[PDB]
Symmetry: C4
Subunit: 274 residues, 4 copies
């Protein structure tokens, strides 16, 4: 084809980072996005590739991702500028055959490197691949304001957050029936937070980093963005509700169960407390 | 005429879904819109029609809508993408002569189907047709944040919500003098919630689904959007007011009555409590 | 010149109504704007004029505005659509020689008429003309959310609202040193509310209609928009502050006085209480 | 090159003022921005220069800035109009050889002058130049809503604000490890507030003017905007949290310290209280 910036994947990355920015979720360099691609996606654009792809080691060996190409956001790069200069804020990287490093085949100009949260992204892509038998292809991280605020007031427990978020918007249980995982606060950009994030991803498509943000997984950019957006929307309702003094009525456990049955999903049981 | 995407109705659907999305009311696939058309509206675009219109059964027979064409949003489709690809997110469907199903004459590509809330839409279109002698042509559903938040704190009663919303913005009583109906929480996408919604529509142009969202009816897209927007605006004022501790002063019952008289409307009497 | 839609005044009206709409201040038909023009402003566009200008009587004789041309928003017209169709949502009207009615020389198509708040607009234009010796030319009304919310919690008194708003943003006393007038709630679209609004305008460039909205006056669209925007910005800060429980510290009376002296303005003394 | 409006610096100024405006930080003329340029930046555009550059005295001699060119926003000019008319809202000024005044080489048409906050800008540019050995080139002021609201509730102390803001978003300590300085309220547009601002800038890249706004410094427009945006984002989380009643859990002192170590920064020690 022609210019890679016009491909479905770069256009998708631009739309996603732009919408998130417009959402007020990604100030400065807060936030990151990675989409797993097939060699066939990037092959039409061979002539756009760097002739001397820079090689970068991975924090730790990730053999299951060996030879896998991804389009990712850069380290210290603003979601806001992606639309202005895709190549400087986005990069297509390909993990080597041992899953010990990757080559930047396109983008990330001016010596830019992938997001410092790559361990969380790649390790999670790994688990989601196994959890969904290869369906999930996107890991998205954003600093969703209301979800962040809620982590300072709600008990930081998967059951608690899952249940309250399900209560904050009817469709939530249907969009993320597996619930929302939550980690204790951890130093970001480390293999440790990445591994802890991947662990939650074995079950949850959404994972919260208290006082920091949210991680989401999905089969497409649209579905992954929509997943986070649904959770942040519910979080937004909850913040207003808690600000008005709390709930006087809410969706009941039995209603939540009837909802799950109707849409054919199996909701995280431990969140059906009360 | 030329391309149907450029018609007044597709352009209207794009503007409406776009504005709502920009309002933060329709994350993911949350929300739906249906506009009743005349055969004469779509006739200029016969060449844009599908040659093998897919036929889909209705949840239940709706004889009064027999042979009626509508432009609707799709199931699992994002209001945000309508502007990007009208045909994939919008569909023109025509109810068959028995009102037992409909043919997708245009749009809803990739085997997409109309919103799973079609029962609520179509059944409500039915009642609104009878209630307004054919004037209403639009049923719109959106997840208006503040109205949703208010359903967890305000008593879920038509009189209560109508009165508080009328108090939250002066023009409210004039825009929806018939008040705001409210249902108990129910499983969405069912014939039951649809029928319950239609029942409220016999009188109210606005109906709330607690912990879920709002339904509105109107003669045009602009008026229907404006109706919901007016209710959500008042809801927004109320949330701030309740968050500041509550009202110290407000529009009085007598003032509300003087307002109704001045604009020649008969306000829902049961909401003129106090 | 060429098409009147491209004139400085129609372009200004489009920019102003658009920015306000984007501010979330003018849902549906909530809000209105009128700009006083000179015959010389509209003369270049004679060929754009209606050949059979519709004549409309005024609610009451306004002789000082005799022969004065204005560009106004229409009744039931949405600020949101002005940019889409200026002529259908905007109209240039000219008051007759007795100030007993006006001719619609351009716009307000489809038999549209000026805003039902014209009495408040025109009567206020009258007082502002006298108060500023002809400098003010714009009267703008919008449903500024936070200012509306504050009218349910703050004592509805000019001194109270002026003082709190001055405290909510440092530049406020400098932008509206004459303070903010406030009326008791009144039926909108009446000669009575219009006259009451004009009365406040003899001194205040900003006037609040409790549970309804705000009126502002200024020499240009930019200054008038900026005035309201400054007041709504301060109101927004106050709502957050009151929502967090109230102020622990604030700008003091002496600081407010030093501020007035520094910028050479005489702040409304009755608001320098405490 | 060609037209100066298309240069990297004017385009940068337009993007920055536009994004801020869209953020709701710069209503009316609230806010200002100055970027230090090299003669080499403006030399390609000599033909765009004013032939009779107006000379304006400085509030006080600033010898270290002698012969330095800057692009600044104008006094009483709206950030919103920069994109519409760069030359009328922006000006390139050059300080004379004694640092006693400056010539307006381009822009600031219609006899416009630089922001009345120029003393705060220039004096701060001075300190930041010394503090960063010439790396910082931008001083930005904006009326960030949430940060303003917080100044009425949080103790106006550098340690307090720094600590709470670091707690309100994980990356904060990493983006501004030197903390946030805060001044007592002072009359704006004076040499006194400017000098007090510069003093804080010797250490802090962010300085708060209680009940007024925020000042930020940085090497580029993007980094400076991002810095303020990160602080306002954290402030936004805090306002929601305080509105919900306060924090139940938060980032701990030890976690904040581990965070600083991991990213190789030395966080303001006096903010690591508790
Ligand atoms: Zn962040
Ligand atoms: Zn992050
Ligand atoms: Zn190859
Ligand atoms: Zn929703
Ligand atoms: Zn819904
Ligand atoms: Zn036909
Ligand atoms: Zn309104
Ligand atoms: Zn109004
Ligand atoms: Zn003439
Ligand atoms: Zn301000
Ligand atoms: Zn300022
Ligand atoms: Zn030269």
């Amino acid at each position: 084809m022609q210019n890679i910036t016009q491909s479905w994947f770069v256009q998708g990355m631009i739309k996603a980072t732009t919408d998130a920015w417009l959402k007020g979720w990604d100030e400065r360099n807060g936030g990151n996005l990675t989409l797993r691609l097939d060699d066939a996606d990037i092959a039409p654009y061979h002539d756009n590739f760097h002739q001397q792809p820079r090689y970068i080691p991975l924090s730790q060996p990730m053999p299951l991702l060996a030879n896998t190409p991804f389009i990712v956001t850069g380290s210290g790069k603003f979601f806001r500028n992606v639309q202005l200069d895709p190549a400087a804020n986005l990069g297509i990287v390909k993990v080597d055959s041992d899953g010990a490093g990757y080559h930047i085949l396109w983008g990330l100009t001016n010596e830019a490197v992938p997001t410092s949260e790559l361990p969380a992204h790649f390790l999670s892509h790994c688990e989601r691949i196994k959890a969904t038998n290869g369906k999930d292809r996107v890991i998205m991280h954003c600093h969703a304001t209301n979800l962040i605020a809620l982590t300072y007031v709600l008990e930081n427990d998967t059951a608690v957050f899952t249940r309250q978020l399900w209560e904050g918007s009817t469709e939530c249980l249907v969009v993320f029936p597996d619930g929302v995982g939550i980690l204790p606060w951890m130093v970001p950009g480390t293999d440790a937070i990445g591994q802890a994030t991947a662990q939650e991803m074995q079950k949850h498509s959404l994972v919260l980093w208290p006082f920091h943000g949210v991680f989401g997984s999905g089969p497409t950019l649209d579905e992954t963005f929509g997943l986070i957006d649904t959770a942040e929307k519910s979080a937004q309702v909850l913040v207003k509700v808690y600000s008005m003094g709390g709930m006087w009525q809410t969706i009941s456990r039995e209603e939540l169960i009837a909802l799950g049955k109707r849409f054919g999903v199996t909701p995280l049981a431990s969140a059906l407390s009360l």
